[PDB]
Each structure stands twice: as structure tokens, then as C-alpha cells.
Amino acid sequence: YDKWEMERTDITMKHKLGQYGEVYEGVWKKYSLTVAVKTLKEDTMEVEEFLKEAAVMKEIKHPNLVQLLGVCTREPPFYIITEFMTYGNLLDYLRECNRQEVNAVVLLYMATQISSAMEYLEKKNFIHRDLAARNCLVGENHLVKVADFGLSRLMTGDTYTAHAGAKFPIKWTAPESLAYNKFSIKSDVWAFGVLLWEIATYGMSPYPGIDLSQVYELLEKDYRMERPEGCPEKVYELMRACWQWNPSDRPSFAEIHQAFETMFQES
Numbered sequence: 565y566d567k568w569e570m571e572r573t574d575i576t577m578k579h580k581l582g583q584y585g586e587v588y589e590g591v592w593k594k595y596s597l598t599v600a601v602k603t604l605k606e607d608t609m610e611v612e613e614f615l616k617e618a619a620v621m622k623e624i625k626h627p628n629l630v631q632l633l634g635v636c637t638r639e640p641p642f643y644i645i646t647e648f649m650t651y652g653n654l655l656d657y658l659r660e661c662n663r664q665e666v667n668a669v670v671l672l673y674m675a676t677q678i679s680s681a682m683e684y685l686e687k688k689n690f691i692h693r694d695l696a697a698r699n700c701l702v703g704e705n706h707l708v709k710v711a712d713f714g715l716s717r718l719m720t721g722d723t724y725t726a727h728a729g730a731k732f733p734i735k736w737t738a739p740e741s742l743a744y745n746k747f748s749i750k751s752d753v754w755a756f757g758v759l760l761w762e763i764a765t766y767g768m769s770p771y772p773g774i775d776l777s778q779v780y781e782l783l784e785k786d787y788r789m790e791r792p793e794g795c796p797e798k799v800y801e802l803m804r805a806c807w808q809w810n811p812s813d814r815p816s817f818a819e820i821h822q823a824f825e826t827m828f829q830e831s
């Protein structure tokens with residue numbers, strides 16, 4: 565913590581970024597380096613939660629997870645300083661891309677990177693709880709990094725039970741979570757599949773036109789999204805594997821990763 569600790573004067577805010585809360589495009593003066601800074605203002609997030617988030621992130625070290633650069637946690641306002649990803653989020657990136665550049669191989673590459681980060685989180689006993697395209701970031705040369713959020717500590721064989729009155733992103737949310745507010749790394753696997761669908765559709769919204777009130781009812785009757793146009797059958801089977809009712813029957817991120825890596829190497 566003292567090694568990550570920084571003076572707020574080391575950073576100059578440049579631009580405000582707004583669906584994420586209080587996140588700014590800042591400049592780390594010393595290195596003339598563009599950075600991203602999360603600020604705590606108006607008690608939008610509780611202090612102790614904000615601090616734990618910063619304490620957790622400094623344990624994270626993976627090429628596909630947004631890297632912590634430093635923190636300002638002595639005098640309010642409190643800062644979290646992370647690396648800046650040039651091209652924004654994966655959802656808007658995919659929607660606005662040149663699909664001749666961002667082709668099938670690049671889609672494969674994007675999934676391999678994400679599954680890599682979640683394989684890491686799987687091994688280090690963490691869960692994400694909001695895996696989606698909007699929460700993935702894109703750098704140069706089709707580099708993708710999963711947002712360090714927002715991570716909770718949880719042993720692989722345990723279950724996080726969410727607070728009461730908690731509202732989830734229903735179309736990304738596993739059945740066990742929708743019904744009993746239970747979360748697992750296997751529920752993150754579910755979300756990955758929905759993310760996997762967003763990639764193949766280049767950013768289309770999931771379960772199109774389907775009402776959120778009738779999603780869980782559809783899921784328990786074994787309804788799943790159809791294979792997108794152009795999607796390899798091998799990819800849809802992984803999607804389907806991620807979308808199985810019993811989380812025990814859902815593949816591990818380690819297994820998912822090897823699958824996509826093999827598909828990526830073989831292309």
C-alpha cells in the first residue's frame with residue numbers, strides 16, 4: 565500500500581469519461597503518460613468498499629487485466645490510478661469497427677485474451693460479477709483487457725450470496741443468480757458465454773426484444789440464444805456449454821481458454 569501510494573499532485577485531470585461513474589482521463593506528469601483515474605465523490609461508493617477495491621487490485625497482475633499504477637488513499641479525495649486503454653470499451657469498439665480488419669481471427673484472439681484473464685482469476689480465487697463487453701477495454705493491435713472492477717474474494721468451491729434488493733444485468737446473469745442471488749466462478753462462465761455472443765454479433769444486444777421479466781422463465785425451459793450468422797459451430801458449442809443450467813456442468817475457464825487458444829493457433 566505504501567509502495568503504491570502516490571501524491572495527487574502527480575496527476576492532472578484532462579478529460580472526463582460517463583456510464584462508469586467518476587472516471588477521468590488523466591496525465592501522470594512525471595512520465596508524460598496518459599492514465600485513467602477513479603475518484604470518490606459525493607459518497608457514490610462507500611469509502612471502505614473503495615479502499616478494499618484498491619487493496620485487491622494491487623494483488624492483480626495479468627496482461628489481460630487493467631493494471632493498477634498507483635493510489636491516493638491518505639487524504640480525500642481518494643484516487644485509484646490505472647493504465648489507459650486507447651480505443652475504449654469492447655462493445656462500442658465492435659459496433660464501430662472495420663470487420664475486414666476485426667475479422668474472425670481477431671474475434672478468436674479477443675476471446676482468448678478474456679478467457680486468459682478469467683482463468684487467472686479462477687486460479688487466484690476471485691470473481692468478477694459483471695463480465696460483459698462494455699466492461700472490457702481495447703488497446704492498440706486488438707489488445708483486450710478485462711476491467712479489474714469490482715472483484716470479490718471467493719474460493720473456487722464456494723458461493724457468494726448477493727445482498728437483498730440487488731438488481732442484476734438480467735441478460736448477462738446466470739440462472740442461479742437470478743433466482744437465489746448466488747454467484748460463483750461458474751456464474752462468471754455463464755456471463756462469458758453472453759460476452760462470447762456479443763463478440764460474434766459485433767455488439768448486438770442479447771436476447772433481442774425478449775422481455776426481462778420472462779427471461780428466467782425461458783431459461784428454465786431450456787431456451788438459449790441462437791447461433792449468430794457467421795459464428796463457427798465450435799464457438800457456439802462453447803457458448804452453449806457456458807449456458808448449462810447446472811453450474812457444475814459448465815466448463816472451467818482453464819478449459820475454455822485452451823479451447824480458444826487451440827482454435828487461434830490453428831487459424
Ligand SMILES: CCS(=O)(=O)Oc1ccc(OC)c(-c2c[nH]c3ncc(-c4cncc(C(=O)N(C)C)c4)cc23)c1
Nearest residue numbers: 581582584600602630644646647648649652653712713
Ligand atoms: C479498473 C480500475 S477501476 O475499476 O477502479 O476504475 C475504472 C472503471 C472503469 C473503467 O472503464 C471501464 C476504467 C478504465 C481503466 N482504463 C481505462 N481506459 C480507457 C477507458 C475509456 C476511455 N474512453 C472511452 C471509454 C468508453 O468506452 N466509454 C463509454 C466511456 C472508456 C476507461 C478505462 C477504470
